[PDB]
Coordinates of C-alpha atoms in Angstrom, one line a residue:
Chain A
X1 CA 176.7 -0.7 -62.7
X2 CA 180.5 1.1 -61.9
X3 CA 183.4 2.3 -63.8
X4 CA 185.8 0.3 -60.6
X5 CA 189.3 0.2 -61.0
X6 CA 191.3 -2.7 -62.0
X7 CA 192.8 -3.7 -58.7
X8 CA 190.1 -2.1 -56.5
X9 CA 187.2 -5.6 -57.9
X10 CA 188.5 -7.3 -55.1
X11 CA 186.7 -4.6 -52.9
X12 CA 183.5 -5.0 -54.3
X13 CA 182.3 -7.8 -52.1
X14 CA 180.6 -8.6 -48.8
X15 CA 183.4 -8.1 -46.4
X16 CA 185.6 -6.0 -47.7
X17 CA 187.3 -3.3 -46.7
X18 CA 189.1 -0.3 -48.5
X19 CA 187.9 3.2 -49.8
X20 CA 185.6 1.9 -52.8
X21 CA 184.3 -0.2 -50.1
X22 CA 184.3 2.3 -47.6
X23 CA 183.4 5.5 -49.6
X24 CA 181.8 4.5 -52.2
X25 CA 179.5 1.4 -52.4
X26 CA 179.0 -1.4 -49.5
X27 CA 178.1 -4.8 -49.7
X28 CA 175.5 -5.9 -46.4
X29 CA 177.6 -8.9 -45.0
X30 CA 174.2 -10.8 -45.9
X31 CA 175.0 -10.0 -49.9
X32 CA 172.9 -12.6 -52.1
X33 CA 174.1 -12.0 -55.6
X34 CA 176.8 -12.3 -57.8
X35 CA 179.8 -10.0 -58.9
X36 CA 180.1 -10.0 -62.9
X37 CA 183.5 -8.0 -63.8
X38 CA 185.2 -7.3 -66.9
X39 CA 187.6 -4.7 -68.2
X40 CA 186.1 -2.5 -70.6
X41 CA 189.2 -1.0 -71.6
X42 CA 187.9 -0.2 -75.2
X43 CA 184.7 1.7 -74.3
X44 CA 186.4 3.6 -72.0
X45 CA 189.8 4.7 -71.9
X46 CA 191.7 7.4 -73.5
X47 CA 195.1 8.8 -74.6
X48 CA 194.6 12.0 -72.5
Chain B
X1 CA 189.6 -12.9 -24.6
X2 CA 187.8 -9.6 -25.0
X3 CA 185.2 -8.5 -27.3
X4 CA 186.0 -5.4 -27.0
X5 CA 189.4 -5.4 -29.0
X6 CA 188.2 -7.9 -31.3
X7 CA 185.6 -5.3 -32.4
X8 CA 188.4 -2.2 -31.9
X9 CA 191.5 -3.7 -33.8
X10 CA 189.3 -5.8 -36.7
X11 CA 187.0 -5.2 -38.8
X12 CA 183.2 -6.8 -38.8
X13 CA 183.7 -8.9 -41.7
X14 CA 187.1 -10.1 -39.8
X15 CA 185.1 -9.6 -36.3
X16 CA 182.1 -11.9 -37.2
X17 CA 183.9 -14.5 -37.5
X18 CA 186.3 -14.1 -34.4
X19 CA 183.6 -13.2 -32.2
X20 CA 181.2 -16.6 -33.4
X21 CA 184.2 -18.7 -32.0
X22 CA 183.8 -17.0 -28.5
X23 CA 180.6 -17.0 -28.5
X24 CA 180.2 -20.3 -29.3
X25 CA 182.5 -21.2 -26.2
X26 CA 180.7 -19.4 -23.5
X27 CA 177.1 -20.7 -24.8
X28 CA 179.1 -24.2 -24.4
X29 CA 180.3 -23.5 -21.5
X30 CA 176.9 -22.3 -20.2
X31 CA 174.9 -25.1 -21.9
X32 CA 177.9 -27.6 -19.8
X33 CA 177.6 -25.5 -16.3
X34 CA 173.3 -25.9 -16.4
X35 CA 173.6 -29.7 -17.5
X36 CA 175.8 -29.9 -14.7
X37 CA 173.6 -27.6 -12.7
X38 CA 170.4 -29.8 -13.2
X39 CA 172.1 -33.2 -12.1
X40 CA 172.9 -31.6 -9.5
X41 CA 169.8 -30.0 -7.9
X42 CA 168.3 -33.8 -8.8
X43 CA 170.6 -34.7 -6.5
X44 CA 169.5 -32.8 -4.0
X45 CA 166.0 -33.1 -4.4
X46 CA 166.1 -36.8 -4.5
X47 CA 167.7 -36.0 -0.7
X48 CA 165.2 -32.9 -0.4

């Protein structure tokens, strides 16, 4: 489970590259799975 | 042509798939030089 950015999904996937790719998680090049994203803009997201 | 800056200027997920073409023209090129080799060396053993 991650709080990812918007633009930053596209990262999230085998090959990849880019600092939430890099830094963060990695995906094997092998990856067997899917990617399920959706904003969850209500739960978490504030005025501050 | 070199391996070396295929793996130096891209990235693996990039790289993977540049390298597979190379390497899939030297193992050609290999599997057409000992098909040629072993009609050959029939050759000259038929005259051996």
């Amino acid at each position: 489970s991650f709080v990812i950015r918007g633009d930053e999904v596209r990262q999230i996937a085998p090959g990849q590259t880019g600092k939430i790719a890099d830094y963060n998680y990695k995906l094997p090049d092998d990856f067997t799975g899917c990617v399920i994203a959706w904003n969850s803009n209500n739960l978490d997201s504030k005025v501050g | 042509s070199v391996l070396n800056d295929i793996l130096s200027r891209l990235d693996p997920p990039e790289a993977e798939v540049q390298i597979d073409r190379l390497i899939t023209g030297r193992l050609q090129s290999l599997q057409t030089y000992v098909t040629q080799q072993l009609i050959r060396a029939a050759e000259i053993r038929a005259s051996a």
